[PDB]
Amino acid sequence: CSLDQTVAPGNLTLCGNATLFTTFRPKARFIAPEGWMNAPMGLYQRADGSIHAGYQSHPKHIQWGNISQGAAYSSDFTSWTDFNGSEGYKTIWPSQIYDIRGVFDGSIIKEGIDGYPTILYTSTSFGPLGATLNEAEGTETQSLAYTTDDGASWIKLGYGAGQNPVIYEWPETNLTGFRDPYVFQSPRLEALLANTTSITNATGDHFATISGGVHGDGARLFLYRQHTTGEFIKWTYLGPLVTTGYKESYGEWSGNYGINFETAGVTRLNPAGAAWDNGSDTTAVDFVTFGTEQGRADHQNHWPLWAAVDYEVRDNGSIEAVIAYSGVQDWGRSYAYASFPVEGYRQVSVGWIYEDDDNVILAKQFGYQGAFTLFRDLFVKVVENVSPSTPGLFEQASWSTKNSTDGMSVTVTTLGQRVVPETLAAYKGNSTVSTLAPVMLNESAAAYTPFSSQPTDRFYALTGSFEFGLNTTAKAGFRVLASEEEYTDIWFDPASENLTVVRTASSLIKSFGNDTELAKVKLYEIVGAESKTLNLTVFVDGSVIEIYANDEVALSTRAYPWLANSTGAGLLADGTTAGDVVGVSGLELWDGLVDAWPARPANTSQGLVWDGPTAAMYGLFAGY
Amino acid sequence: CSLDQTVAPGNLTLCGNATLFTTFRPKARFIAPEGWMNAPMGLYQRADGSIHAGYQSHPKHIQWGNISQGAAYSSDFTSWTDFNGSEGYKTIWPSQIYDIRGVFDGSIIKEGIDGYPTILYTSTSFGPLGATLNEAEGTETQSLAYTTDDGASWIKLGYGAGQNPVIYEWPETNLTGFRDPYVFQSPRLEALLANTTSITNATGDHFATISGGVHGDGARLFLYRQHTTGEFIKWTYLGPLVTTGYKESYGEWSGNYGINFETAGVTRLNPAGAAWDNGSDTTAVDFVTFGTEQGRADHQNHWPLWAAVDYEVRDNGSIEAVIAYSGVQDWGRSYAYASFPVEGYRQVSVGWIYEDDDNVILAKQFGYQGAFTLFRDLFVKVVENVSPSTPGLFEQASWSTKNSTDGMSVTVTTLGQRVVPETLAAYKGNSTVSTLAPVMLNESAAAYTPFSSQPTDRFYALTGSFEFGLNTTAKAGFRVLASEEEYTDIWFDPASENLTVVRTASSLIKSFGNDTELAKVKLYEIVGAESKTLNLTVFVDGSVIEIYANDEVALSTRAYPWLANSTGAGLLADGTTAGDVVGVSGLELWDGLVDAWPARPANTSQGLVWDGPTAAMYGLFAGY
Ligand SMILES: *[C@@H]1O[C@H](CO)[C@@H](O[C@@H]2O[C@H](CO)[C@@H](O[C@@H]3O[C@H](CO[C@H]4O[C@H](CO[C@H]5O[C@H](CO)[C@@H](O)[C@H](O)[C@@H]5O[C@H]5O[C@H](CO)[C@@H](O)[C@H](O)[C@@H]5O)[C@@H](O)[C@H](O[C@H]5O[C@H](CO)[C@@H](O)[C@H](O)[C@@H]5O)[C@@H]4O)[C@@H](O)[C@H](O[C@H]4O[C@H](CO)[C@@H](O)[C@H](O)[C@@H]4O[C@H]4O[C@H](CO)[C@@H](O)[C@H](O)[C@@H]4O[C@H]4O[C@H](CO)[C@@H](O)[C@H](O)[C@@H]4O)[C@@H]3O)[C@H](O)[C@H]2NC(C)=O)[C@H](O)[C@H]1NC(C)=O
Ligand SMILES: *[C@@H]1O[C@H](CO)[C@@H](O[C@@H]2O[C@H](CO)[C@@H](O[C@@H]3O[C@H](CO[C@H]4O[C@H](CO[C@H]5O[C@H](CO)[C@@H](O)[C@H](O)[C@@H]5O[C@H]5O[C@H](CO)[C@@H](O)[C@H](O)[C@@H]5O)[C@@H](O)[C@H](O[C@H]5O[C@H](CO)[C@@H](O)[C@H](O)[C@@H]5O)[C@@H]4O)[C@@H](O)[C@H](O[C@H]4O[C@H](CO)[C@@H](O)[C@H](O)[C@@H]4O[C@H]4O[C@H](CO)[C@@H](O)[C@H](O)[C@@H]4O[C@H]4O[C@H](CO)[C@@H](O)[C@H](O)[C@@H]4O)[C@@H]3O)[C@H](O)[C@H]2NC(C)=O)[C@H](O)[C@H]1NC(C)=O
Ligand SMILES: *[C@@H]1O[C@H](CO)[C@@H](O[C@@H]2O[C@H](CO)[C@@H](O[C@@H]3O[C@H](CO[C@H]4O[C@H](CO)[C@@H](O)[C@H](O[C@H]5O[C@H](CO)[C@@H](O)[C@H](O)[C@@H]5O)[C@@H]4O)[C@@H](O)[C@H](O[C@H]4O[C@H](CO)[C@@H](O)[C@H](O)[C@@H]4O[C@H]4O[C@H](CO)[C@@H](O)[C@H](O)[C@@H]4O)[C@@H]3O)[C@H](O)[C@H]2NC(C)=O)[C@H](O)[C@H]1NC(C)=O
Ligand SMILES: *[C@@H]1O[C@H](CO)[C@@H](O[C@@H]2O[C@H](CO)[C@@H](O[C@@H]3O[C@H](CO[C@H]4O[C@H](CO)[C@@H](O)[C@H](O[C@H]5O[C@H](CO)[C@@H](O)[C@H](O)[C@@H]5O)[C@@H]4O)[C@@H](O)[C@H](O[C@H]4O[C@H](CO)[C@@H](O)[C@H](O)[C@@H]4O[C@H]4O[C@H](CO)[C@@H](O)[C@H](O)[C@@H]4O)[C@@H]3O)[C@H](O)[C@H]2NC(C)=O)[C@H](O)[C@H]1NC(C)=O
Ligand SMILES: OC[C@H]1O[C@@](CO)(OC[C@H]2O[C@H](O[C@H]3[C@H](O)[C@@H](O)[C@@H](O)O[C@@H]3CO)[C@H](O)[C@@H](O)[C@@H]2O)[C@@H](O)[C@@H]1O
Ligand SMILES: OC[C@H]1O[C@@](CO)(OC[C@H]2O[C@H](O[C@H]3[C@H](O)[C@@H](O)[C@@H](O)O[C@@H]3CO)[C@H](O)[C@@H](O)[C@@H]2O)[C@@H](O)[C@@H]1O
Ligand SMILES: *[C@@H]1O[C@H](CO)[C@@H](O)[C@H](O)[C@H]1NC(C)=O
Ligand SMILES: *[C@@H]1O[C@H](CO)[C@@H](O)[C@H](O)[C@H]1NC(C)=O
Ligand SMILES: *[C@@H]1O[C@H](CO)[C@@H](O)[C@H](O)[C@H]1NC(C)=O
Ligand SMILES: *[C@@H]1O[C@H](CO)[C@@H](O)[C@H](O)[C@H]1NC(C)=O
Ligand SMILES: *[C@@H]1O[C@H](CO)[C@@H](O)[C@H](O)[C@H]1NC(C)=O
Ligand SMILES: *[C@@H]1O[C@H](CO)[C@@H](O)[C@H](O)[C@H]1NC(C)=O
Ligand SMILES: *[C@@H]1O[C@H](CO)[C@@H](O)[C@H](O)[C@H]1NC(C)=O
Ligand SMILES: *[C@@H]1O[C@H](CO)[C@@H](O)[C@H](O)[C@H]1NC(C)=O
Ligand SMILES: *[C@@H]1O[C@H](CO)[C@@H](O)[C@H](O)[C@H]1NC(C)=O
Ligand SMILES: *[C@@H]1O[C@H](CO)[C@@H](O)[C@H](O)[C@H]1NC(C)=O
Ligand SMILES: *[C@@H]1O[C@H](CO)[C@@H](O)[C@H](O)[C@H]1NC(C)=O
Ligand SMILES: *[C@@H]1O[C@H](CO)[C@@H](O)[C@H](O)[C@H]1NC(C)=O
């Protein structure tokens, strides 16, 4: 095993465990110290204003198993510190018959048991567990634990009658899944249900959704309501909140609803951020976010979706969330988005970016798998004065349209997403910032034009505004992590409405994924404008490439170039001519970003271990 | 619910939990503070000379489940003190994927991990588990833990490759069971295997048996040897030590070998106690003790047996224990005998006495189930100068015979059992002792003759020597726990060789067992004697009746009379005449015995709990 990045890669499968630990590793984002991670969990803003972030964790392994909550905290979403206790950076782990198979996703009741922050989580035990398997009742239940030390440790309620697990009966037969409890307060839902509380007797101020589905009949989000305020044992099933069909798709802008939901959440937003009104705010919109499985041919069969919904009250005192429009939270290699409330009327969302090594060829050599996305403020994106001649505008796929009285303009409403400002400020302020001169891409434009200032490593941000003609057939974008022999190309093609990441040359190492990523982006044309604009921001962080367009579209992916000099970046141009010109302005390079884990050394591997021959006997975990 | 014991019992099923806690409860023996107990485990003499006793325990329940090690200690086998830690009187409990289904029986390596006492125990996980079920490999494994504080707590080795569990591969296919590791040192087995260690490479000073069997083909005791001295991870399977047939019986004196062994142990004894020679002591005998299941129509389908064995070395460097003769360790409601070495060349054995409420009618009202037997010294019982005309002597069923050179006398050898002298001394010294005048039972003998001194409560011992004519057809014995309306009759009938406990009148409460207990007792007739003698000792301890005959035969049973005055005792006589006389001498009553748990209050119930609806979902434990 040679680690010479000035020559072609050898056979890297001969390299030892964690020998490639630093090679492709993100430095500027949330990531476990080592080993396997997946979904964010247990997210909450603590009493001191800091952010507690949990995550599904399997230390010293590079596949999922014994799944536990790893945790850390931050005052600004950006610079983090690990918890350190008797189980290292873990704070909840399998320990009881009811959760011994895994401590799955859960969410926080901020004022819970004895007034302490309390997690409601999926406690798993033995048996087939999966949407394509024959799961039985009891395998997935929901349990409580609380913290008296602000997340350094958690105390589970006892096992038994009237204690853990607190939710165990399947609300409908033949479930595909029954997990990922999302606890939330909702003045909106309380107001809607207030006239029906005699029917159900459920009058608490917390609601909980549980994600699942029904075999052969599509996904389901089940709604529960806390039976009595201040009491956390009894949760009353109201009914299904979201019901979708078996592999139903709302269309090209909306992914596919698959067969089963995972990590679903419920929020209410307005143009500024989170909305906590009872329905009285006419600018507020109710949203559900959710993962779906088995409705996609690639990306691990997983879509991270969202939908705007209109609530209807059923006669039995439950709520039907009728989907008004439906979109995609991230179009790339990410899943398991969780959102949580933050002071100042914010709702903040974060997901998990998996690797692109699905055959597990270099995972042991990495010594870790997975990272988070960046933390994103959610809000209602409103675009005013939109031209009715915007192509496809009245499909209203992942947006709504409201005509002006005179019919000459349209107001567009959709889900907005933007990186939390704390992170953008910290990134910019800690970076070497190069403000670049605007560039007209015309007949003289090369295919690739390096920026006048270049990155110094694999940790940088790019921004640019691309102005296109209304009838352009030109393509433009950014090339990143680039040398002569390796590069990753981010293209937007207004004629097709497709944002792509072409990865055929991303790496000389052939075992990593190289498929083309694709997102749809609607450029809402403004009344009186003779052009249409794409605002593109790109974060490069080790192997993560995370793309944001117009505070709306997100696409996370992976690139693993071998050569030490595959760090460059610049502009891409295709079919730009004297007549079909792309004007690029607001160009900026931020070189360096932030060291997100200042207390961690460069190599936080502790080695990898094997569970031994019993892993296959138990059949629950891969064992490595 | 009335608790008036001066009138007939009402419907006691209406009584609350633990309302009958003290009513039938032993006071003079080892018993858990409350709840469910079964097999003794983790028995060892600590460095300070005290005895550590563990037991299978399910606190606050009256059926088996979440099975754990409860523990206590004693300086004299007799007066005990509970451990008290973070889990009360528990010291090992289910906590890892490999043992979450139960911490089953285990035994002690006195100088184990880092020189500390170390337990090797059966760690159980999910799946069908039982001799009549389709068990799979992994469900039962064997794991290590060690104590740095003399049994107050235990630290398990980590889960994984080269750590716990340490034994997991089935040594043969289609096992009926794979549990109850019995670790022991054996100069005898080391000497026998010394010429074969090149074949196996196993040269350690500890051996371990694991109890089981093969579906359709009878029970098996599997022998392992520690691979290397001072190292405790690697144990090498040598071969089957004991192999018996599917429901094979050696005969009327030997129970039945069933389909599967449980709690088997290996020892070597001589007339004084434990023998630690390499084979050079010609008075020493190798013994195996073992439970069998499914070879009995009653007594929970369980026989606690023993066998004298002659070891043969196989060509592959393993040992066949060939059964020379075979007997019964206790003929009544007891099982799961464990033996352990004690200083002064002793081997001490103790078992579990279950209740006689198999339909679980009053278990909740008790608030507990189970106790230990008394602790018993094992030794080789040798009877000299036995008459060759002793009926059935040369069947050699559960004994051996050696003729004198002239053929006029026989030396009989069998397994001896007697109550440890520490307990007999403490019992006698703390009791009100009545030495009774000898009684000739003849034509004037009533059916029942109360002793001249009577017990004052349900805690007493009786002793007597019954001298019978060589051709008697008379029966005699002891009646205990007796009033006019309730009593329990212990008879010996030399003509049939049967010792019986008739329980048709033991209690007015009809839900308890009332079947007649039966043991075979061989009165070895002495050359020149014109009579044959039965030495009978009986311990009455709450509901336990524990009978010892001739330091050889043991029979433990249960009686639950309701009336407060059903405490009396005396002599039984049937068919005694002027010509067929039974002389009773050495008669003694010890009233009171010892308070075995001086620190415990009378009622140590903590209430009972229900596991809730998930118990049936998991299907592992009853849940109460
Ligand atoms: C199979 O068997 C298993 C083993 O028995 C069993 O698991 C056990 O289950 C029991 C019962 O559910 C659990 O017991 C509970 O424990 C809770 C605390 O748990 C935390 O702390 C314990 C103990 O902590 C000590 O010891 C450890 C070990 O040495 C140390 O490391 C600690 O530092 C600490 O040491 C100090 O204390 C020791 C003595 O205890 C000293 O020896 C020592 O010197 C130190 O001073 C830990 O062991 C726990 O860790 C385990 O669990 C966590 C997850 O929780 C895991 O991450 C970890 O790996 C371990 O597995 C944990 O950290 C107790 O809070 C709980 O007690 C209460 O609830 C019961 C039941 O309701 C009540 O009876 C009791 O009164 C308590 O309730 C009151 O208090 C709470 C708030 O404190 C209130 O909410 C409540 O309303 C009530 O209030 C009352 O009092 C108030 C006034 O005070 C009043 O105002 C109110 O009005 C009201 O009256 C309970 O004891 C036990 O933890 C499990 N153990 C393990 C190892 O798993 C398993 O379930 C069984 N399985 C099956 C299938 O049956
Ligand atoms: C799923 O995830 C699960 C959670 O991660 C996982 O379970 C965990 O597995 C790990 C790995 O196997 C276990 O870690 C081991 O722990 C052993 C100690 O275990 C006892 O103590 C711990 C911790 O004790 C503290 O904290 C608790 C909780 O607060 C307190 O209550 C205690 O009082 C105590 O607190 C003090 O310390 C804290 C910091 O730790 C402080 O915060 C605090 O302020 C106090 O000061 C307990 O938690 C354990 O309880 C659990 O387990 C028991 C059963 O054992 C249960 O009954 C109970 O309910 C709990 O479940 C327990 O009491 C360590 O000994 C062990 O460490 C060693 O081994 C590793 C691996 O080999 C070595 O790397 C390491 O060096 C150690 O080995 C050396 O030391 C031993 C002797 O000490 C030698 O034999 C050995 O050769 C070696 O010696 C070396 O050093 C010598 C010099 O020192 C030198 O001479 C030699 O040459 C040599 O170099 C390891 O850390 C962990 O306990 C599990 N936790 C739980 C909760 O289960 C589970 O397996 C996962 N499942 C799957 C399927 O993957
Ligand atoms: C005295 O000790 C006991 C512990 O032994 C304490 O707890 C009680 O324990 C018994 C078991 O011994 C429980 O009985 C079972 O109850 C089931 C129904 O429970 C629901 O209704 C009752 C009555 O209103 C409620 O009290 C329960 O509420 C509690 O539990 C819920 C969770 O469900 C919590 O949220 C609450 O807070 C409470 O903690 C429940 O709502 C019942 O289904 C179960 O069923 C079987 O029971 C008997 C068996 O003899 C049969 O009649 C019946 O046919 C079922 O039989 C089964 O038999 C076999 C083997 O099991 C199966 O193969 C069959 O298919 C069949 O299912 C049983 O009756 C009792 O609920 C529980 N009480 C509690 C927790 O409060 C007592 O509290 C304690 N007393 C005191 C004063 O301390
Ligand atoms: C680097 O990290 C790893 C952890 O990832 C550390 O541990 C190693 O981990 C790998 C797994 O990544 C283990 O590989 C597996 O080994 C099995 C055979 O093991 C035995 O032989 C080896 C080689 O001589 C010994 O080292 C082992 O000894 C250890 O374990 C025993 C317990 O058995 C202990 O007592 C010892 O003390 C040691 O701890 C063993 O004796 C092998 O069967 C297993 O098999 C599959 O493996 C690959 C998969 O790619 C295939 O080639 C093969 O066909 C099998 O494939 C499976 O694939 C699928 C899915 O799993 C199944 O459906 C198929 O049916 C098929 O079974 C695998 O190769 C390795 O043993 C282990 N080493 C240890 C513990 O020492 C490394 O130590 C660490 N390195 C360093 C320097 O720290
Ligand atoms: O960590 C569990 C949480 O992640 C989510 C969202 O992704 O589910 C993931 C899947 O978890 C389990 O799958 C594991 C499987 O059992 C194991 O055999 C191996 O293949 O690894 C899998 C995970 O990579 C579960 O069985 C699946 O049904 C589930 O999709 C979230 O829903 C969970 O809270
Ligand atoms: O406590 C386990 C130890 O006791 C022994 C000797 O008696 O085995 C007893 C039995 O334990 C298990 O049985 C339980 C069963 O699983 C459960 O469903 C319920 O019925 O209660 C049973 C015990 O009463 C085990 O499954 C059986 O196979 C076993 O006979 C000893 O061998 C164990 O170490
Ligand atoms: C990048 O590195 C490779 C290999 O060392 C080299 O061929 C190339 O000239 C380097 N410089 C570039 C692409 O600017
Ligand atoms: C790479 O090395 C592996 C062993 O890790 C070997 O099996 C494989 O054939 C090698 N690939 C080559 C030489 O292309
Ligand atoms: C309420 O009605 C809906 C629609 O029929 C149904 O799916 C749900 O199960 C009902 N809720 C309850 C608690 O029965
Ligand atoms: C919205 O405006 C477009 C363009 O003026 C028009 O075609 C459509 O009919 C209008 N919709 C409504 C509801 O008026
Ligand atoms: C650098 O980043 C840190 C950590 O996020 C932040 O607190 C600090 O303000 C940043 N420095 C600047 C903006 O100069
Ligand atoms: C644009 O994307 C869609 C998928 O939404 C695809 O069908 C179409 O072929 C793409 N067209 C181009 C030119 O990239
Ligand atoms: C024993 O108690 C019962 C019921 O109180 C009574 O009938 C009997 O006379 C009492 N005395 C005896 C049997 O000596
Ligand atoms: C005893 O009480 C139980 C209820 O605990 C009742 O079901 C049973 O019929 C009663 N037996 C009688 C009256 O004999
Ligand atoms: C040794 O031989 C016996 C008798 O054939 C056999 O049962 C046992 O499995 C053998 N041992 C090993 C380790 O193969
Ligand atoms: C043992 O003694 C009995 C009675 O004398 C006799 O029948 C039997 O043959 C003797 N056995 C041997 C081996 O001499
Ligand atoms: C009474 O019993 C205790 C506890 O076993 C014992 O130590 C003591 O010697 C006994 N008293 C006597 C024999 O007088
Ligand atoms: C004595 O016990 C045996 C069982 O070993 C039985 O077959 C026989 O009937 C009994 N005889 C008498 C008289 O009790």
Give yes or no for residue A14 CB within 6 A of ligand 8. Answer: yes
- Helix, strand, or coil (residue A22): coil
The radius of gyration of chain B from alpha carbons, rounded to an integer in Å, stands at: 24
To test the contact with chain B by mutation, choose from A98, A617, A624 the residue with the greatest count of B C-beta atoms within 10 A, namely A617
Ligand nearest to the CA of B360: 3
Tell how far CA B462 is from the center of its chain.
21
A602: closest CA of chain B, how far (Å): 27
DSSP letter assigned to residue A218: -
Dihedral sign for Cα A210, A94, B57, B303, please. Answer: positive
A619: closest CA of chain B, how far (Å): 10
Q: Measured between beta carbons, which residues in chain B are less than 8 angstroms from residue A614?
A: 98, 138, 141, 165, 168
CA dist A325 and A305 (Å) reads 11
Virtual torsion, Cα B125, B126, B129, B134, nearest 10 deg: -130
Cβ contact A143:A164 at 8 Å: yes
B221: closest CA of chain A, how far (Å): 23
CA dist A496 and B427 (Å) reads 96
Tell how far CA A91 is from the center of its chain.
22
Q: Measured between beta carbons, which residues in chain A are less than 8 angstroms from residue B161?
A: 609-613
Total CB pairs under 8 A between chain A and B: 69
How many of the other CB atoms lie within 10 Å of CB of A95? 16
Cβ contact B225:B236 at 8 Å: yes
Residue A479 — φ and ψ, nearest 5°? -100, 135
Is the CB of B169 less than 8 angstroms away from the CB of A620?
A: no
CA dist A572 and A466 (Å) reads 11
Produce one character per residue of B349-375: b if its CB has 16 or more CB atoms within 10 Å, e if not.
Answer: bbbbbbbbbeeeebbbbbbbbbbbbbb
- In this structure, the strands spanning B35-45 and B368-369 are parallel
| Residues ≥6 apart with Cβ < 8 Å to A141 | A98, A122, A123, A124, A125, A165, A167, A168, B614
Using a CB–CB cutoff of 8 Å, tell me whether A246 touches chain B: no
Resolution, in Å, please?
A: 1.9
CA dist A433 and A431 (Å) reads 6
Ligand nearest to the CA of B429: 17
CA dist B183 and B106 (Å) reads 8
Tell how far CA A307 is from the center of its chain.
15
For ligand 16, atom 5: residue with the closest CA: B407
CA dist B137 and B340 (Å) reads 29
Dihedral sign for Cα B156, B157, B159, B164, please. Answer: negative
B614 by Cβ neighbours in 10 Å (0-12 / 13-18 / 19+) ranks as: buried
Cβ contact B219:B269 at 8 Å: no
CA dist B395 and B409 (Å) reads 16
DSSP letter assigned to residue A254: S
B262 is in an annotated binding site: yes
Closest-CA residue to A255 (of A220, A289, A217): A289
What does the H/E/C string look like for A593-604? Answer: CCCCCCCCCCCC
Is the CB of A97 less than 8 angstroms away from the CB of B95?
A: no
For ligand 5, atom 30: residue with the closest CA: A130
Closest-CA residue to A365 (of A66, A34, A47, A90): A34
How many of the other CB atoms lie within 10 Å of CB of B384? 12
Q: Which two tokens stand for residue B555?
A: 């029979």
Cβ contact A374:A427 at 8 Å: no
Closest-CA residue to A250 (of A333, A330, A323): A323
- Helix, strand, or coil (residue B454): coil
Atom of ligand 10 nearest to the CA of A403: 1
From residue B381, alpha-carbon distances to B234, B332, B474, B525 in Å are 38, 21, 27, 15
From residue A332, alpha-carbon distances to A300, A373, A515, A559, B44 in Å are 11, 11, 11, 12, 61
* Complete DSSP assignment for B4-36: -TTS----GGGS-TTTTTTTS--SSS---SSEE
Cβ contact A523:A460 at 8 Å: no
B398 by Cβ neighbours in 10 Å (0-12 / 13-18 / 19+) ranks as: buried
Residue B48 — φ and ψ, nearest 5°? -80, 5
CA dist B39 and B261 (Å) reads 14
- Helix, strand, or coil (residue A141): strand
* Complete DSSP assignment for B489-525: EEEEETTTTEEEEE-TTS-S-TTS--PPEEEE----P
Segments of A75-117 assigned E as strands: 80-82, 90-92, 102-109
B296 by Cβ neighbours in 10 Å (0-12 / 13-18 / 19+) ranks as: middle
Cβ contact A56:A41 at 8 Å: yes
Produce one character per residue of A559-577: b if its CB has 16 or more CB atoms within 10 Å, e if not.
Answer: bbbbbeebbbbbbbbbebe
Is the CB of A614 less than 8 angstroms away from the CB of B162?
A: no
Q: Which of B159, B161, B617 faces A168 most closely, judged by CB atoms? A: B617
Using a CB–CB cutoff of 8 Å, tell me whether B607 touches chain A: no
Closest-CA residue to A78 (of A425, A546, A413): A425
Using a CB–CB cutoff of 8 Å, tell me whether A125 touches chain B: yes
Using a CB–CB cutoff of 8 Å, tell me whether B160 touches chain A: yes
Cβ contact B371:B37 at 8 Å: yes
Cβ contact A304:A334 at 8 Å: yes
Query: Which residue type occupies A469?
Result: G
Is the CB of B169 less than 8 angstroms away from the CB of A613?
A: yes
The radius of gyration of chain A from alpha carbons, rounded to an integer in Å, stands at: 24
CA dist B164 and B15 (Å) reads 45
User: Separation of A403 CA from ligand 10 center, angstroms?
Assistant: 6
Gaps in chain B following residue numbers (C to N > 2.5 A): none
Query: Which residue type occupies B409?
Result: S
From residue B323, alpha-carbon distances to A272, B257, B280, B399, B615 in Å are 86, 12, 20, 12, 43
CA dist B101 and B351 (Å) reads 23
Segments of B559-622 assigned E as strands: 568-574, 582-591
A63: closest CA of chain B, how far (Å): 15
Is the CB of B618 less than 8 angstroms away from the CB of A100?
A: no
Segments of B332-435 assigned E as strands: 334-342, 346-353, 368-369, 371-372, 376-386, 400-403, 410-419, 432-435
Helix ranges (DSSP H) in A185-293: 187-193, 197-200
User: Separation of B400 CA from ligand 16 center, angstroms?
Assistant: 13
A181: closest CA of chain B, how far (Å): 18
Q: Which of B100, B141, B161 faces A97 most closely, judged by CB atoms? A: B100
Segments of B207-301 assigned E as strands: 207-214, 219-226, 235-243, 260-270, 273-274, 285-293
β-bridge partners, A517? A501
CA dist B125 and B123 (Å) reads 7
Is the CB of A169 less than 8 angstroms away from the CB of B98?
A: no
Give yes or no for residue A64 CB within 6 A of ligand 5. Answer: yes
Q: Measured between beta carbons, which residues in chain B are less than 8 angstroms from residue A617?
A: 136-138, 168
Task: Quickly tell me which residue has 């359709």 as its tokens.
Answer: B216
β-bridge partners, A462? A538, A589
CA dist A545 and A553 (Å) reads 14
Dihedral sign for Cα A164, A169, A174, A179, please. Answer: negative
Q: Which helix (H) or strand (E) holds A424?
A: helix A421-430
Q: Could you tell me the domains of chain B?
A: 1-428 (2.115.10.20), 429-624 (2.60.120.560)
Cβ contact A165:A98 at 8 Å: yes
| Residues ≥6 apart with Cβ < 8 Å to A619 | none
Tell how far CA A612 is from the center of its chain.
33
Give yes or no for residue A619 CB within 6 A of ligand 4. Answer: no
Using a CB–CB cutoff of 8 Å, tell me whether A86 touches chain B: no
B102: closest CA of chain A, how far (Å): 10
Q: Which of A100, A160, A612 faces B611 most closely, judged by CB atoms? A: A160
Chain B, nearest residue to A96 by Cα: B95
Cβ contact B491:B582 at 8 Å: no
β-bridge partners, A214? A175
What does the H/E/C string look like for A293-329? Answer: ECCCCCHHHEEEEEEEEEEEECCCCCEEEEEEEEEEC
* Complete DSSP assignment for A509-537: -TTS--PPEEEE----PBTT-SEEEEEEE
- Helix, strand, or coil (residue A16): coil
Cβ contact A418:A550 at 8 Å: no
Q: Which helix (H) or strand (E) holds A429?
A: helix A421-430
Task: Quickly tell me which residue has 């005969």 as its tokens.
Answer: B251
Closest-CA residue to A607 (of A354, A368, A355): A368
For ligand 3, atom 60: residue with the closest CA: B622
Experiment used for this model: X-ray
How many of the other CB atoms lie within 10 Å of CB of B429? 10
Cβ contact B594:B430 at 8 Å: yes
| Residues ≥6 apart with Cβ < 8 Å to B619 | none
Residues B583, B587, B589: CA angle, nearest 5 degrees: 150
Using a CB–CB cutoff of 8 Å, tell me whether B19 touches chain A: no
User: Separation of A367 CA from ligand 4 center, angstroms?
Assistant: 16
Query: Which residue type occupies B527?
Result: V
Is the CB of A161 less than 8 angstroms away from the CB of B620?
A: no
CA dist B556 and B372 (Å) reads 10
Closest-CA residue to A499 (of A468, A481, A484, A477): A477
CA dist A262 and A259 (Å) reads 10
CA dist A219 and A263 (Å) reads 12
Q: Which two tokens stand for residue B409?
A: 């006398």
Q: Which helix (H) or strand (E) holds B198?
A: helix B197-200
Closest-CA residue to B83 (of B2, B183, B150, B4): B150
